[PDB]
Amino acid sequence: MSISMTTKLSYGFGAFGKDFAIGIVYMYLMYYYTDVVGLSVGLVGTLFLVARIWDAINDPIMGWIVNATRSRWGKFKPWILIGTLTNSLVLFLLFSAHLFEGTAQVVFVCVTYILWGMTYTIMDIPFWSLVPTITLDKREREQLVPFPRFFASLAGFVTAGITLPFVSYVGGADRGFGFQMFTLVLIAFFIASTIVTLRNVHEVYSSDNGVTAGRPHLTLKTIVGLIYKNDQLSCLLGMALAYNIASNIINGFAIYYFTYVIGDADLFPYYLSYAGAANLLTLIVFPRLVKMLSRRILWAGASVMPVLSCAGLFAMALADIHNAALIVAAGIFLNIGTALFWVLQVIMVADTVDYGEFKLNIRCESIAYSVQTMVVKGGSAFAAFFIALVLGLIGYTPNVAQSAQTLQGMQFIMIVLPVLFFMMTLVLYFRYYRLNGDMLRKIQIHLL
């Protein structure tokens, strides 16, 4: 059947565009880090409160959407359609009108702001949920589904580095109106995610309608009913929250360590620009690595792998070589190898129902796939209490120690935070006595 695969080759256009698109705005934001003032409305705390409603209610309900109760047709394409266009509406708004910056926040700023928000979430759940669905062939699912990154691979490798010198010529103190121009750049290729997908992707639902109107639609609420999960989601969420913590302290604090190291450097040279172009190189090795055996073990190591550098850092404190130009460069080089940790993670939530659906045997789609990828992110908002624990008592031992070292000290705590949460990740996903043959062991079972 070409019908389901056309959902993904065009969806590959999604992947090369959507990621190319988040590549740009996000990267662009960085000189707006240079640009941030927002005289009347724009405090950090206030924007945060908008972020409060930004994520949470969006993805439970996103999943909750997809089958039309009163209309007899239901599929992802309009879901993902509701995303290609929900974002682009915004960015086109960012492009068009001339003296809108003069007006206060009350008015249009609201209207736009909603729409970009939605996309943030109506692209997380459509995309890495609609790729695994493609041609039915059982075991090779997991081996063909994180591969595609190959062309997405180029985009991030690139936004941070070479657009920047060319972007830094046109206009000064106009960044608001500046990306106004460059929007066309991004839109053209990403509008190219909305074109191809438009006349193409809506298919397997066509199939189903033709086929009896399908009580299968209700099946999607039965496989929430009969099993919300066999036991799949609730243990798997916990560890994921711990996952994202490391991303948000890498990406979030990535900028800031470059902003904030011991000494002065007029250069501002090799690191994080190269660290981006170093991180994703490991996407060629590890996604294709374990030639007979399972991605899982790859993964278990990998859950260690972002953990690991702290473990390395923790051990190398015992070494104590410089404590000055050492800490400026303290094992981020590991950063060459992180890459494909989220996708197998996002797969992990709806998989027992994924192969459980396989037992149902008829169709392909998902529910819980959203609830980890959205609760994951929030759970660092509990982390403000957690920081009182991180300093609190765990490390902390009878008072005296305060003077020796503070830069190696605060960095290690910043770096312990994901790690101390990370005890849900490996413990809960390794210790023997786990199960009989499971979605993981299906490909590993093919061995013997």
- Evaluate whether 369 touches 346 at the Cβ level (below 8 Å): yes
- Evaluate whether 100 touches 108 at the Cβ level (below 8 Å): yes
CB-based contacts of 390, cutoff 8 Å, min separation 6: 413, 416, 417, 420
Whole-angstrom Cα distance, residue 395 to residue 210? Answer: 63
State the CB neighbour count (10 A cutoff) for residue 187: 19
Which residues contribute to the annotated binding site?
A: 18-19, 124, 128, 149
Token duo for residue 393: 């008592």
Whole-angstrom Cα distance, residue 163 to residue 273? Answer: 12
The sign of the torsion formed by the CA atoms of 65, 69, 75, 80 equals negative
- Evaluate whether 147 touches 56 at the Cβ level (below 8 Å): no
Token duo for residue 154: 């180029």
Domain ranges, ordered by start, for the chain: 1-227, 228-448
Whole-angstrom Cα distance, residue 211 to residue 303? Answer: 43
Whole-angstrom Cα distance, residue 429 to residue 417? Answer: 20
- Evaluate whether 29 touches 94 at the Cβ level (below 8 Å): no
- Evaluate whether 80 touches 123 at the Cβ level (below 8 Å): yes
- Using H for helix, E for strand and C for coil, what is the string for the chain? CHHHHHHHHHHHHHHHHHHHHHHHHHHHHHHHHHHCCCCCCCCHHHHHHHHHHHHCCHHHHHHHHCCCCCCCCCCHHHHHHHHHHHHHHHHHHHHCCCCCCCCCCCCHHHHHHHHHHHHHHHCHHHHHHHCCCCCCCCCCHHHHCCCCHHHHHHHHHHHCCCHHHHHCCCCCCCHHHHHHHHHHHHHHHHHHHHHHHHCCCCCHHHHHHHCCCCCHHHHHHHHHHCCCCCCHHHHHHHHHHHHHHHHHHHHHHHHHHHHCCCCCCCCCCCHHHHHHHHHCCHHHHCCCCCCCCCHHHHHHHHHHHHHHHHHHHHHHCCCCCCCCHHHHCCCHHHHHCCCCCHHHHHHHHCHHHHHHHHHHCCCCCCCHHHHHHHHHHHCCCCHHHHHHHHHHHHHCCCCCCCCCCCHHHHHHHHHHHHHHHHHHHHHHHHCCCCCCCCHHHHHHHCCC
Q: Biggest alpha carbon distance in the chain? A: 75
Rg (CA), the chain: 23
- Evaluate whether 242 touches 425 at the Cβ level (below 8 Å): yes
Query: In degrees, to the nearest 5, what angle opens at C-alpha 124 toward C-alphas 138 and 239?
Result: 75
Experimental determination technique: X-ray
Half-sphere exposure of 93 (CA within 13 A, CB side): 17
Kindly list the distances between the CA atom of residue 86 and the CA atoms of 154, 168, 270, 414, in Å, as whole numbers in the listed order: 25, 29, 37, 36
Kindly list the distances between the CA atom of residue 422 and the CA atoms of 212, 332, 427, in Å, as whole numbers in the listed order: 47, 19, 9
State the CB neighbour count (10 A cutoff) for residue 202: 19
Half-sphere exposure of 210 (CA within 13 A, CB side): 5
- End-to-end Cα distance, the chain: 30
CB-based contacts of 262, cutoff 8 Å, min separation 6: 324, 325, 327, 328, 407
Whole-angstrom Cα distance, residue 308 to residue 332? Answer: 11
Which residues contribute to the annotated binding site for an alpha-D-galactoside?
A: 18-19, 124, 128, 149
Whole-angstrom Cα distance, residue 348 to residue 328? Answer: 37
**Long-range CB pairs of 203-210, under 8 A, 24+ apart, other chains included:** 203/3, 203/4, 203/6, 203/7, 203/75, 203/77, 204/3, 204/4, 204/7, 204/75, 204/133, 204/363, 204/364, 205/73, 205/74, 205/75, 205/77, 206/3, 207/3, 208/363, 209/72, 209/73
State the CB neighbour count (10 A cutoff) for residue 431: 8
Location of structure tokens 């934001």: 29
Kindly list the distances between the CA atom of residue 361 and the CA atoms of 212, 222, 357, 364, in Å, as whole numbers in the listed order: 16, 14, 6, 9
Token duo for residue 187: 């839109």
Q: Indicate the Cα dihedral angle 156, 157, 159, 163, nearest 10°.
A: -160
Location of structure tokens 């106004």: 180
Half-sphere exposure of 172 (CA within 13 A, CB side): 1
State the CB neighbour count (10 A cutoff) for residue 10: 20
Kindly list the distances between the CA atom of residue 136 and the CA atoms of 281, 306, 346, 354, in Å, as whole numbers in the listed order: 30, 33, 19, 12
Angle, helix 2-35 to helix 76-95, in steps of 10 degrees: 30
Q: Indicate the Cα dihedral angle 109, 112, 113, 118, nearest 10°.
A: 170
Amino acid at 137: D
Q: Tell me which residue of 138, 134, 143 sits closest to 292, measured CA to CA.
A: 143
- Evaluate whether 360 touches 219 at the Cβ level (below 8 Å): yes
CB-based contacts of 196, cutoff 8 Å, min separation 6: 10, 13
State the CB neighbour count (10 A cutoff) for residue 402: 8
Angle, helix 371-378 to helix 44-55, in steps of 10 degrees: 160
Location of structure tokens 């106009």: 174
State the CB neighbour count (10 A cutoff) for residue 414: 15
State the CB neighbour count (10 A cutoff) for residue 434: 11
Whole-angstrom Cα distance, residue 395 to residue 416? Answer: 10
- Evaluate whether 227 touches 353 at the Cβ level (below 8 Å): yes
- Evaluate whether 194 touches 88 at the Cβ level (below 8 Å): yes
Q: Tell me which residue of 357, 106, 111, 103 sits closest to 223, measured CA to CA.
A: 357
Kindly list the distances between the CA atom of residue 94 and the CA atoms of 75, 113, 171, 260, in Å, as whole numbers in the listed order: 30, 10, 16, 32
Whole-angstrom Cα distance, residue 337 to residue 284? Answer: 10
Resolution in Å equals 3.3
Whole-angstrom Cα distance, residue 151 to residue 23? Answer: 13
